[PDB]
Structure formats: C-alpha cells, structure tokens
Design a protein around this motif. Sequence first.
Motif, short mmCIF file in Angstrom:
data_model
loop_
_atom_site.label_atom_id
_atom_site.label_comp_id
_atom_site.label_asym_id
_atom_site.label_seq_id
_atom_site.Cartn_x
_atom_site.Cartn_y
_atom_site.Cartn_z
N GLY A 244 0.84 -1.21 0.00
CA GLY A 244 0.00 0.00 0.00
C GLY A 244 0.87 1.25 0.00
N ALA B 116 -1.82 -10.69 9.66
CA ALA B 116 -1.36 -9.64 8.73
C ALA B 116 -0.82 -8.48 9.55
CB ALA B 116 -2.48 -9.23 7.81
N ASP C 146 -8.94 -1.25 4.67
CA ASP C 146 -8.25 0.02 4.31
C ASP C 146 -9.20 1.17 4.63
OD1 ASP C 146 -6.86 2.21 3.27
OD2 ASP C 146 -6.16 1.12 1.47
N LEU D 17 -6.59 -12.35 6.08
CA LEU D 17 -7.71 -12.64 5.15
C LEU D 17 -7.14 -13.22 3.86
CD1 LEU D 17 -9.45 -9.18 5.64
CD2 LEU D 17 -10.07 -11.34 6.75
N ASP E 41 -9.37 -4.01 -5.08
CA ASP E 41 -8.19 -4.25 -4.21
C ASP E 41 -8.61 -4.25 -2.74
OD1 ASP E 41 -7.91 -2.21 -6.51
OD2 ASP E 41 -5.82 -3.03 -6.47
N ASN E 42 -9.70 -3.54 -2.37
CA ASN E 42 -10.04 -3.24 -0.94
C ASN E 42 -11.14 -4.16 -0.46
OD1 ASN E 42 -8.08 -1.40 -0.19
ND2 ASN E 42 -9.26 0.37 -0.85
N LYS F 49 0.73 -4.52 9.24
CA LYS F 49 0.86 -3.28 8.46
C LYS F 49 1.92 -2.41 9.12
CE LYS F 49 -1.97 0.03 5.94
NZ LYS F 49 -3.37 0.50 5.73
N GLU G 190 -6.15 -9.64 11.85
CA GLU G 190 -6.58 -10.93 11.29
C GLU G 190 -6.14 -11.02 9.84
OE1 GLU G 190 -10.77 -11.18 11.07
OE2 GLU G 190 -10.73 -13.36 11.22
#
Length: 292
Positions: A16, A34, A147, A83, A130-131, A36, A81
């Motif tokens: 991103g 996940a 997002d 996905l 994408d989201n 970020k 979490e």
Amino acid sequence: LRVGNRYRLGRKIGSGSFGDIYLGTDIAAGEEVAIKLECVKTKHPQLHIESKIYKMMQGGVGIPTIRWCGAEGDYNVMVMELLGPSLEDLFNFCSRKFSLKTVLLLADQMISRIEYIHSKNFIHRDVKPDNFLMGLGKKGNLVYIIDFGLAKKYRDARTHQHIPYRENKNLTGTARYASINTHLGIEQSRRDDLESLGYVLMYFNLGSLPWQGLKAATKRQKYERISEKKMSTPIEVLCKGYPSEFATYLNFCRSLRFDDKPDYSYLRQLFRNLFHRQGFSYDYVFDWNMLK
Ligand SMILES: Nc1ncnc2c1ncn2[C@@H]1O[C@H](COP(=O)(O)O)[C@@H](O)[C@H]1O
C-alpha cells in the motif's frame, strides 16, 4: 525479522502507498496474522487514526479484527486478522472474467459492508476491487472490506447531523472508480461510495472500464483525463448488453441528494430479483470455488 517479542514478520503480501503488509506469526498464540507498517516522519501519521476507526467498526460481519497497535523504532505497527486474496487478485486468477452469478453474489455482500460502515457514521472513499478480500477457512464465502486510510465522519455520532455541502476538494482516492461528484471536487457522502461500487460491478462484467489505462505524471491529471471520458459516457451506454439492473443501480445512486440515506434494501432487491429470474441459487459457489 521480528516485531517486539510476540510477532514474526514473514514475506511482504501487499504494497500500500500508506504502508506495506506482511504475512506474520503470532508466536504466543500460534496463529498467522497480517502486519501493516507505516514509517513516522511528520507529526501526522495516519495508521493510529485507521486503527481507531477499525476499533469503532468491530463486531461487524466482514470487518477484520485488530489484535495489536503500537510502535517499534520509527514505524507504526497494526497487527490484524489474516484474510484471503482480494477480488482484483481473484479476477486476474479467473482470466479477468467473472460469470453474472459471481458478480451478483459479490454485489449483495459489497452493498451490505458499505451499509454497515455508513451505519457507523463513516464513508470509505476508497471503494475498489483491491479493498475487498474473501475470508480464509470457514469464512471463505465471506466478503470483507479493508483500508480505512481515507475514511471520514459524514454525520455527527451524537445528533446524526450530516456534514455540510462543500466544493474544491483534494482528489485523494482511486480515479478509475471515483463518483462523478468527486471529479467536480464536491465533498463525498454515502451516495459516492455506492456509485463507486457501481463502477466496480461494471468493471467485473466488462473486464475493464472504457476510461482505463490513461497515462499521467500526477494524481490530479489522472482524475481529469478519466473525467472527460466518464462524463461523456451515459450510464445506458456503459451498461449496454448487460442486465438493466446495472443501469438502474448507477442511475439510482446518481439521483441521491448529498445528504439522502440510500435505500440499501431496494438496491440489494434489484440484484436478487435478477439473480432468481436467471435461475441461480445462493449456494455461495463463486467461479474460483470450481477450480479442480
Ligand atoms: N489483513 C489482510 N490479509 C491479507 N491481505 C491483506 C490484508 N490487508 C491488506 N492486504 C493486502 O494488501 C493490499 C493493499 O493493502 P492496503 O494498502 O491496506 O489497501 C490489499 O489489496 C490486499 O491484497
């Protein structure tokens, strides 16, 4: 690589422009996650905001859980979490061809997620394939929205007083799917999210939108190049050769007042009636579940 003591940063699974996303391991719980990462550089990083919004969304169907927020060194960290693949990844995997049944199956869930976000006093403002991510395992049939980087309050939490009508806005989302209102620099409301979903749906039907692939050095130029083709293409020409319901949908969304509450039920009902008339069953078998 590790993050604190508890987390194992694996390989990057998404870039991103806000941050990069790594597949990871909660070592202490023995679960894949996940993770970020955002680099802090000013006194206005935005992952802290995004996490506060995620937390206000929690206990929503198709909202990922947040496990941890904090900082290591010069990075903000959000652990969530894990996905499955995005609808963009799945589209590419299926040769940029979805059946009407898959598109209608997705449409019903994608309206519901947007509805749920609106019920919590926020608009998303970055609605694109994408989201949206399918879940893993038992949640393999569940469409998730991610997002909240560009999300904002459209009404007071307390009063439900809508934000006022304003113009000359910063064009900050993705241009392919932006509402005609966003293109004219008008403040976004609930109608803009739902229109964007309209263009996402016709994207899946066609394989591409007739305003795609136009080169620009700047974000402002990207919107302006796309705006010309988009505003000159009638809803009725865009959707031609496809069920009327895709026209009716985009038309309904464009007819909404700035501060109108959409009829989310009606729009869902449109696609359901088409779904049943075609003779499809709600078995949650998407094109990609048929891969042998
Ligand atoms: N929790 C997650 N699980 C799996 N993939 C994710 C997750 N969050 C983000 N991604 C991937 O990262 C890409 C970009 O993330 P973002 O920049 O946050 O929209 C998405 O298109 C997904 O493919």
